[PDB]
Design a protein around this ligand. Structure first.
Ligand SMILES: *[C@@H]1O[C@H](CO)[C@@H](O[C@@H]2O[C@H](CO)[C@@H](O[C@H]3O[C@H](CO)[C@@H](O)[C@H](O)[C@@H]3O)[C@H](O)[C@H]2NC(C)=O)[C@H](O)[C@H]1NC(C)=O
Ligand SMILES: *[C@@H]1O[C@H](CO)[C@@H](O[C@@H]2O[C@H](CO)[C@@H](O[C@H]3O[C@H](CO)[C@@H](O)[C@H](O)[C@@H]3O)[C@H](O)[C@H]2NC(C)=O)[C@H](O)[C@H]1NC(C)=O
Ligand SMILES: *[C@@H]1O[C@H](CO)[C@@H](O[C@@H]2O[C@H](CO)[C@@H](O[C@H]3O[C@H](CO)[C@@H](O)[C@H](O)[C@@H]3O)[C@H](O)[C@H]2NC(C)=O)[C@H](O)[C@H]1NC(C)=O
Ligand SMILES: *[C@@H]1O[C@H](CO)[C@@H](O[C@@H]2O[C@H](CO)[C@@H](O)[C@H](O)[C@H]2NC(C)=O)[C@H](O)[C@H]1NC(C)=O
Ligand SMILES: *[C@@H]1O[C@H](CO)[C@@H](O[C@@H]2O[C@H](CO)[C@@H](O)[C@H](O)[C@H]2NC(C)=O)[C@H](O)[C@H]1NC(C)=O
Ligand SMILES: *[C@@H]1O[C@H](CO)[C@@H](O[C@@H]2O[C@H](CO)[C@@H](O)[C@H](O)[C@H]2NC(C)=O)[C@H](O)[C@H]1NC(C)=O
Ligand SMILES: *[C@@H]1O[C@H](CO)[C@@H](O)[C@H](O)[C@H]1NC(C)=O
Ligand SMILES: *[C@@H]1O[C@H](CO)[C@@H](O)[C@H](O)[C@H]1NC(C)=O
Ligand SMILES: *[C@@H]1O[C@H](CO)[C@@H](O)[C@H](O)[C@H]1NC(C)=O
Ligand SMILES: *[C@@H]1O[C@H](CO)[C@@H](O)[C@H](O)[C@H]1NC(C)=O
Ligand SMILES: *[C@@H]1O[C@H](CO)[C@@H](O)[C@H](O)[C@H]1NC(C)=O
Ligand SMILES: *[C@@H]1O[C@H](CO)[C@@H](O)[C@H](O)[C@H]1NC(C)=O
Ligand SMILES: *[C@@H]1O[C@H](CO)[C@@H](O)[C@H](O)[C@H]1NC(C)=O
Ligand SMILES: *[C@@H]1O[C@H](CO)[C@@H](O)[C@H](O)[C@H]1NC(C)=O
Ligand SMILES: *[C@@H]1O[C@H](CO)[C@@H](O)[C@H](O)[C@H]1NC(C)=O
Ligand SMILES: *[C@@H]1O[C@H](CO)[C@@H](O)[C@H](O)[C@H]1NC(C)=O
Ligand SMILES: *[C@@H]1O[C@H](CO)[C@@H](O)[C@H](O)[C@H]1NC(C)=O
Ligand SMILES: *[C@@H]1O[C@H](CO)[C@@H](O)[C@H](O)[C@H]1NC(C)=O
Ligand SMILES: *[C@@H]1O[C@H](CO)[C@@H](O)[C@H](O)[C@H]1NC(C)=O
Ligand SMILES: *[C@@H]1O[C@H](CO)[C@@H](O)[C@H](O)[C@H]1NC(C)=O
Ligand SMILES: *[C@@H]1O[C@H](CO)[C@@H](O)[C@H](O)[C@H]1NC(C)=O
Ligand SMILES: *[C@@H]1O[C@H](CO)[C@@H](O)[C@H](O)[C@H]1NC(C)=O
Ligand SMILES: *[C@@H]1O[C@H](CO)[C@@H](O)[C@H](O)[C@H]1NC(C)=O
Ligand SMILES: *[C@@H]1O[C@H](CO)[C@@H](O)[C@H](O)[C@H]1NC(C)=O
Lengths: 490, 490, 490
């Protein structure tokens, strides 16, 4: 007796987790948290973004006014969702640069349409087809006007529509390509000639081309769709002698945050900021491996399926007399991260050190706050999956996205390694600081035993040990006793 | 008496600045410097890049030779500046793929034009229009030759121009689209037919299309502009029966560092390496938030409006007997960053430690030198602002630039946090090293009081203290005295 | 006598290497390794990727079936290598969107072709030209069928080919543009009319255009090449009255990892994973400055020509009595990185410390293992060099690649600086840890002399010194002797 022991230590847990640092590929820590979101519910939540489920209609079918899409008239969206089951059920058509028209309508986010009174003096309006039935009757695209001859005449059309509004107008129109010369004459009363649609700033001339194409819904003819945007103070001029599928008015074109996504995920009554084709995903984590296609406030796509961020210190087994932190953790330390164990006249005890514990916890929570719940919003982007082979432009779209993903995946990998190294360093540092402060209090009254413990060379009862732990130990009170015990001749 | 005190310390300032590190969102340091350039003068400096102010002319108007652009003939530039007020004042035209022709001329950086003698036997040359007045007379684009019938004949043209030069030739030509069939006959004496312009490696066939477009400067006709590059040893062949707006020669096409920028900033007589649409900006800082559009040696565009780099240590208030660096800075320390305070027989004093101060300053200046004045040059890039809706290609251009900016903004954020953490570490380290070296000199003659000070257990006058500070203190001289004082029984 | 000295130290080498850290632009370390691959052998190794050397043929010439390319029929590749000497030797042709057709065939990786029996009732098949000789006879592209009139009739063709297969079909076809009206009549017996090639999902109409182009291999006519992909359950329909260069069947179109590269490097019998235009390169290093164009498992392209990664500690000259690590390295320490030197009754000695040496070496090898031999594979990408001026799309392709390279170059620069700082820190740390452990063993029996050495205040013979070095020194055995020597009055 006449001496006491005081050990400094830190906790350890039975169920640690492996993380990666700069120093170590694999190091066990007491706790970690996942930074890559890897699952979705599988449903797209209908809140807080305005979702429009296309059901059997593509956006372009909804635009033109396919009868099955009549329910979509004038609707708006943040996200238009196109289904793989979607199919057209009207006159067969193509759109040169379909992808662009789809994109610009998607981004505009509205199907608002304003009817206008075009002067079609001299032709028959409202042509119909058995290939486009509406309520069991022969019909046509709602937003288009199939003009045909009147009394076997089709006068040369030269029709104007000024934009006297403060906003832009989007006009959608078409050219009919009849399957045969018989159809050409039956419909327009004369041989086919070019169609020219112009403004002060633009001109588009299109040549109708007679001929059979493979029948689609029993139709060998085609309609080719074109568009023209007309600015305030400009004028639409339409010049034709036949084959014109005419506009009935204009679409409003807006700018904002709207987009389109291909998905078969069901739409749920729930609330989630981040939408992917697989369904909505939580956006607490900074990264995700669910889908490169996203809409809203979303984690960034990375290639990794897991990245673990340390949220506690190195986890060190307890060695099997009391002993301190040197190659030794304390599994019995459960009310703190760092603490003291002592042996004195009155027994062997343990107490947590609150200051050091809280300093480590605060710093860890600091970095969690920078990384958790901090995702940023993206809206209309580029397409990232393709159903047809196209070459150059598609090669570029793919390479852009590959490039981006690899750079983010590298950033994620480095960030987590750096953060984890910093966490191991800051938690190791709190242990070292606690030891050093204790060493300083004890002055000449103790010696360092090399194992994270001090040999205190005087009687140091429970109150004395408490004084060291609360930082009120007065070394002068004990120095005489201690020096005599230390520097005695044995 | 019979003892002295020696404290180690570091400076502190009354007006510190907040920075971000890896450890802390907000930590006050003694000084910092801004790494994001956020202002411009508002003028584009005319030095050291060769600036060409388009004034009322676009590059394309200057190319074709609109009369108001006659002053631009044969000029070169590093940067062509196009003004929002620019307007065309000649025959109305369009350019299929205007953006590409604009880009390739801009990048070439020259309007040098070499006249050639084309053999236009059988037609009238030099047609003019009241829509394109030059010096009050009817005229036309300077670089183009409006051919019309001769004696009411327009023979089929089949005209050749070999490239026997060592460099490439850029040919600009056009097709006239008359407003009516009357104009077609009045000008070319016959019905319109295709124009074919070919080389050994290329062919472009264009169909003139008669019809009224909305009048522009009272003209319902149009000219569509095309271009053809002809290689050394190749040959231009022009084949037409009318409607040909012919070239008068070729433009030199160069390769180099030239570009074009849309800006309304006035041009100043001043010198600045980095140009943005907002005006020139200083390029000392590594980052900038003025404009994503830049030309020359420019900071990189980031989203942040400020990033502060620490250029001094943690700023710690002085606690209100002398005391050392432990939770305590020295506001009275003004001739150094680190130093010594002492109490002895002769009073209380302070002296700066030059070595430690200079070590910290040098390292900080080291990192300033890597980051300040080190910008790199970019020249012709992609467009980043768009006046029309286009869909797919524009979506890709935008996404490429968004992607780039977010990656750089992340790099900037991480770099500054890392550098700041390193600065806090290196400045803390110089303090700790100074304490340790002093501790080592004193040997058994002093004890650490826990507050950044030593209790020296012998009389230590001003010269003795100086000896410790200059590193020449001989502990053996004082050991006997010191040991007696330390290990006395009180 | 009655004392001993024990110094802790670390090795130093006569031939150190300069590296960059976060702290220092230039710091000498004992060893480093290069992370940028800067040379190639200059040959493309024929293993392990399937190489197809185009020799005198482009891919497109091999596709169409130019006679000099007959050897390529039905071949597959991972990498098709196109030579700058390649030239066409058949009928002159162009391909609108040549780059896309080249890319999609390259990416598909196969020239497998399946003949089909088209019903060409009413025309002459197998037209030939003296411009396309095969085995000295007039011939034509192997995969194309030049149809001409039969008995001075050319009936309107309306020919079908269903896809009843489970895979897609790629059809290549053409339109002949005769030099004169005489040739048109001689070949097709009538005036030229449009050609329409259609499916259920697509239509392409092309207008043959009569006229002389500059003679190529004495031919003023041209063939323009087009392609059509036909899906399972779809049907190809060809509709023409002349000028049709017909398909003889279809190409298989596959998806996989194939690509094309322009290179003049000879092909060698050797094995290398990474191919560049300059030749194959080793892929041990994480970065390379040989070529931005790569195929296979390749280091990432960066702008730097060298980045040195530290693989040893700071290299410190030996100062010219034994001395420890403080501003002092040990050039005579050759069997370890860290160790002990001593002076005692029995002489002066040196021994390496294995634990500390191995801890540093292991960590360094750890980071080498993460960076060396870990390259990732890329296959078909975008083009990165261009022989013609094109404007907008090329500007984007270039900017995408510039952007990527600058971001990777920054990542490389930062990574190496960070790693090197960490290596200096971990090697410095092993030295400091060894000193501290020794200090702890010695307890009150030694004093720190400030130069990396302890003065041990008792007789400490070779076995005693060994006990300290193996960590079995019992301080209690010597304490009485040591305390008497330390705290004597001199
Ligand atoms: C050019 O060739 C085409 C393909 O051979 C051909 O299309 C085919 O036309 C037939 C005849 O009408 C269609 O067959 C239909 O026959 C009866 C007619 O009463 C219908 O009741 C059936 O529904 C049956 O389908 C084919 O469907 C059609 N084939 C394709 C692939 O579309 C064109 O008619 C030809 N064009 C010309 C101008 O001759
Ligand atoms: C097809 O329709 C066009 C638009 O309605 C029409 O253009 C318009 O033509 C008129 C008549 O020339 C122009 O009006 C001008 O009238 C007198 C004529 O002496 C002039 O002095 C005035 O300057 C006045 O502007 C319109 O300017 C013009 N409108 C537009 C929008 O360009 C075409 O003429 C029609 N084309 C055909 C072939 O009939
Ligand atoms: C339109 O102009 C073209 C260029 O002037 C012209 O092409 C040239 O045609 C001549 C005549 O055939 C070729 O010259 C050849 O002359 C003899 C004919 O026996 C040959 O043996 C020689 O090989 C010699 O080359 C030129 O080669 C050719 N020039 C070019 C650049 O192709 C067209 O013929 C003209 N077209 C029309 C319809 O008149
Ligand atoms: C554009 O409209 C004008 C009429 O304003 C058309 O010109 C007329 O065409 C008819 C029949 O082709 C001719 O008989 C008339 O002589 C023309 N009138 C005038 C005033 O020139 C013109 O054809 C239309 N263009 C197109 C491509 O359909
Ligand atoms: C290209 O030039 C040739 C003349 O070298 C044109 O061919 C002549 O065209 C006229 C009028 O159309 C005919 O009467 C002659 O018989 C043609 N001459 C020959 C030698 O064929 C040809 O039309 C021009 N092509 C174009 C598109 O304008
Ligand atoms: C596509 O094929 C059809 C035949 O199936 C062509 O139509 C015939 O064309 C000839 C000559 O031009 C006419 O005499 C016949 O009256 C047409 N037959 C029918 C049934 O209409 C048609 O011309 C072809 N199209 C093209 C562009 O070549
Ligand atoms: C582990 O870390 C996370 C994030 O700080 C925390 O929410 C969780 O409660 C911790 N788990 C344990 C067992 O401490
Ligand atoms: C979509 O089409 C399918 C199959 O034709 C049909 O059964 C279903 O009811 C349609 N859904 C809607 C909303 O019209
Ligand atoms: C409609 O067009 C014709 C031109 O053919 C014109 O004469 C008529 O007045 C127009 N009707 C209007 C403007 O109501
Ligand atoms: C065309 O149809 C619409 C109803 O869809 C009708 O309001 C309009 O009067 C019709 N016009 C003519 C000329 O039949
Ligand atoms: C998301 O869907 C894609 C296909 O679009 C699939 O590759 C991926 O595995 C999905 N991820 C899930 C369901 O977690
Ligand atoms: C603080 O110190 C007192 C005596 O100074 C000691 O008895 C006690 O254990 C310490 N802690 C608390 C919470 O009172
Ligand atoms: C703060 O730091 C900058 C950059 O080193 C320096 O130029 C400036 O003089 C410093 N300011 C003060 C008050 O020390
Ligand atoms: C540009 O045009 C404006 C308005 O027409 C004119 O006042 C001004 O003088 C022009 N500037 C030049 C340099 O021609
Ligand atoms: C110009 O062109 C005609 C072809 O119509 C030719 O006959 C004449 O010789 C040419 N003049 C020259 C080459 O000076
Ligand atoms: C055409 O105009 C230019 C002056 O701009 C003149 O040099 C040339 O001789 C003219 N040619 C003819 C045929 O009038
Ligand atoms: C630079 O100009 C852009 C518009 O081009 C503007 O958004 C930005 O605020 C400007 N920055 C300045 C003047 O600092
Ligand atoms: C250096 O040491 C001397 C005595 O050794 C002392 O008097 C003095 O204060 C110190 N500094 C200078 C600059 O002389
Ligand atoms: C230097 O480092 C490399 C990589 O660890 C190693 O292979 C090489 O043997 C080392 N060279 C020396 C002289 O130690
Ligand atoms: C390629 O062409 C050259 C020059 O015409 C010829 O000498 C060589 O033999 C050709 N090579 C092959 C493989 O045909
Ligand atoms: C080939 O084409 C003709 C159409 O002109 C057809 O009548 C004939 O039967 C066809 N031959 C076949 C299918 O063998
Ligand atoms: C066309 O040529 C091929 C050989 O290349 C032959 O098999 C086929 O019978 C020929 N057909 C005709 C109609 O001459
Ligand atoms: C690789 O080839 C390119 C040209 O394609 C050249 O710029 C570069 O110097 C080459 N690098 C070598 C041979 O190391
Ligand atoms: C280990 O210690 C023994 C005595 O304890 C000493 O003699 C020896 O030098 C040390 N090393 C080895 C390898 O025996």
């Amino acid at each position: 007796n006449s001496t006491a022991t005081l050990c400094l230590g830190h906790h350890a847990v039975p169920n640690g987790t492996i993380v990666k640092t700069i120093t170590n590929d694999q190091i066990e820590v007491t706790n970690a948290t996942e930074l890559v979101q890897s699952s979705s519910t599988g449903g797209i939540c209908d809140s807080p973004h305005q979702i429009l489920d296309g059901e059997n209609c593509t956006l372009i079918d909804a635009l033109l006014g396919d009868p099955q899409c009549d329910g979509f008239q004038n609707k708006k969206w943040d996200l238009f969702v196109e289904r793989s089951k979607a199919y057209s059920n009207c006159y067969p058509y193509d759109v040169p640069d379909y992808a662009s028209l789809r994109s610009l309508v998607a981004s505009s986010g509205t199907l608002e349409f304003n009817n206008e009174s075009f002067n079609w003096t001299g032709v028959t309006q409202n042509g119909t087809s058995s290939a486009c039935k509406r309520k069991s009757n022969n019909s046509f695209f709602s937003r288009l006007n199939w003009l045909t001859h009147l009394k076997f005449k089709y006068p040369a059309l030269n029709v104007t529509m000024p934009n006297n509004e403060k906003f832009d107008k989007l006009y959608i129109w078409g050219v009919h390509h009849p399957g045969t010369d018989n159809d050409q004459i039956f419909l327009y009363a004369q041989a086919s000639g070019r169609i020219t649609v112009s403004t002060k700033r633009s001109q588009q001339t299109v040549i109708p081309n007679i001929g059979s194409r493979p029948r689609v819904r029993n139709i060998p003819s085609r309609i080719s769709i074109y568009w023209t945007i007309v600015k305030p103070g400009d004028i639409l001029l339409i010049n034709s002698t036949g084959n014109l599928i005419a506009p009935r008015g204009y679409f409003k074109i807006r700018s904002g945050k709207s987009s389109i996504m291909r998905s078969d995920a069901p739409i749920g009554k729930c609330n989630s900021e981040c939408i992917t084709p697989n369904g909505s995903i939580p956006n607490d984590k900074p990264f995700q491996n669910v889908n490169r296609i996203t809409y809203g406030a979303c984690p960034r796509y990375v290639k990794q399926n897991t990245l673990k961020l340390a949220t506690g210190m190195r986890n060190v087994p307890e060695k099997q007399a009391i002993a301190g932190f040197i190659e030794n953790g304390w599994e019995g330390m459960v009310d703190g991260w760092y603490g003291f164990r002592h042996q004195n006249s009155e027994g062997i005890g343990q107490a947590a050190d609150l200051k050091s514990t809280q300093a480590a916890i605060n710093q860890i929570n600091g970095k969690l706050n920078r990384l958790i719940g901090k995702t940023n919003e993206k809206f209309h982007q580029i397409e990232k999956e393709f159903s047809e082979v196209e070459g150059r432009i598609q090669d570029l779209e793919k390479y852009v996205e590959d490039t981006k993903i690899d750079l983010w995946s590298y950033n994620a990998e480095l960030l987590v390694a750096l953060e984890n190294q910093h966490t191991i360093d800051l938690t190791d540092s709190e242990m070292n600081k606690l030891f050093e402060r204790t060493k300083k209090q004890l002055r000449e009254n103790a010696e360092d035993m090399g194992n994270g413990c001090f040999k205190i060379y005087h009687k140091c009862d429970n109150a004395c040990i408490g004084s060291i732990r609360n930082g009120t130990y007065d070394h002068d009170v004990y120095r005489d006793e201690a020096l005599n015990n230390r520097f005695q001749i044995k």
